[PDB]
Each structure stands twice: as C-alpha cells, then as structure tokens.
C-alpha cells in the first residue's frame, strides 16, 4: 500500500532535485522503490496513516541525507574496504563493503546479511547493490526494517530522532549538530510535502 502514500509524483520530486550528472540520477526510480516497499510485511503500512506518512518520510529523509539528495549510489573516496574478518561472514579478496545505495549499506557483516535475506551474493557480488536498482532500494528497506532499530523507533513513539539514533548514534547529543540539521532539514521539508505533522522527539 506504499503507493498510496508515496506516488510517482512524489518521488520524481525527490529523485529530480539531483544533478544531471549525478550516478544515482535514473538508478533511483520509482519502480525500484515500490518493489523493495512491497518485499518488507508492515513497512510503510504500519499504523494510521499519519503513522505511515511519518515512517516513509523518515525514511526518505535518511536516504536523501546518506545519498545527497539521490545524487550518489557509491560512497565518495571510501578509505577502506569496509573489510571485519569474520568467520561468519568472511570478506572477499579484492572487494569493496563501502556504501552502496540509498541507505548506504557497509561491511562484510552487513552485506552478508543483506545478500542472504535479499537473494544476491552479498560477499562475492557487492557490486550489485550499485547495479540493480531493485536489489539497492531492497539494501535499505532491509536495514530499515531488519537490521536496525528505526522501523521499531518511529512506530513506538521515538520519532525521526529515534531513527537518527539507530543510524548513526555518534551524530546525537552534539556529536555533530549539522548532521542532525542535514537529516532533520529533510525530515521536515517531506512531511510538509506529505500535509504530515512532523510529530515529537525530531532531533536528537
């Protein structure tokens, strides 16, 4: 039922703000959206739908600050291979675990993970997450709901702070204000855009 909610309109809004030249320009679409919504039981479907409003803005307000805007499939000059040894999740010789897609999915651990749950080889293709827009839209849906705890914080009362929180924790309680005012900036502009009230607990 995300598509009530959020239309093509909407997103072609979101996605189009994008320089031209951007990757992510024609990678984020719509379409990909949709399908990674519909792949994930109670995403954007829980709740009044004020609820659901929230959540999607929520999570659009994270993409487009972890994305610049839908600008960016692959993180910028990453520093490492994101690479945790692990005999769970063993990284690839000569792979990257840097950000890919809208929720900028890192590490070994993670793409494990994802690749698992999602139906791509994780460790050995990484590369996918930037190249099939389905799989990179079904990265962050994934995280959203499975792998963090911000679909739980913005259906329990914790609002957009709480999703912030269970991103990326070192950004709260002033560990890097405009971080917060990046995400929070968003988060506001997408509920106005949705006629949504922003609710309580915004920042953190």
């Given amino acids: ?80 291979n994101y690479c ?23 590490w070994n651990y993670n793409y494990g993970a994802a690749g698992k749950s999602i139906g791509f080889d994780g460790l050995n293709n990484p590369e996918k997450v930037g190249q099939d827009s389905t799989i990179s839209f079904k990265t962050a849906v994934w995280f959203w709901m499975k792998n963090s705890n911000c679909h739980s914080a913005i259906t329990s009362g914790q609002g957009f702070g709480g999703t912030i929180k269970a991103i990326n924790s070192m950004e709260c309680n002033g560990g890097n204000s405009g971080e917060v005012s990046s995400r929070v900036n968003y988060y506001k502009k997408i509920c106005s855009q949705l006629g949504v009230d922003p609710g309580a607990n915004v920042s953190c």
């Fill in 84 to 106: 945790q040894s692990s005999s769970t999740w063993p990284c690839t010789s000569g792979k990257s675990y840097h950000g890919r897609g809208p929720l900028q999915l890192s």
């Fill in 1 to 80: 039922s995300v598509g009530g909610i959020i239309s093509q309109s909407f997103f072609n809004g979101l996605a189009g703000g994008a320089a031209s030249s951007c990757e992510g320009k024609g990678f984020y679409t719509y379409n990909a959206f949709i399908a990674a919504a519909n792949a994930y039981s109670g995403f954007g479907t829980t709740g009044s739908n004020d609820v659901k409003k929230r959540e999607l803005a929520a999570f659009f307000a994270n993409v487009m600050h972890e994305t610049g805007g839908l600008c960016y499939i692959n993180e910028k000059n990453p520093p490492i």
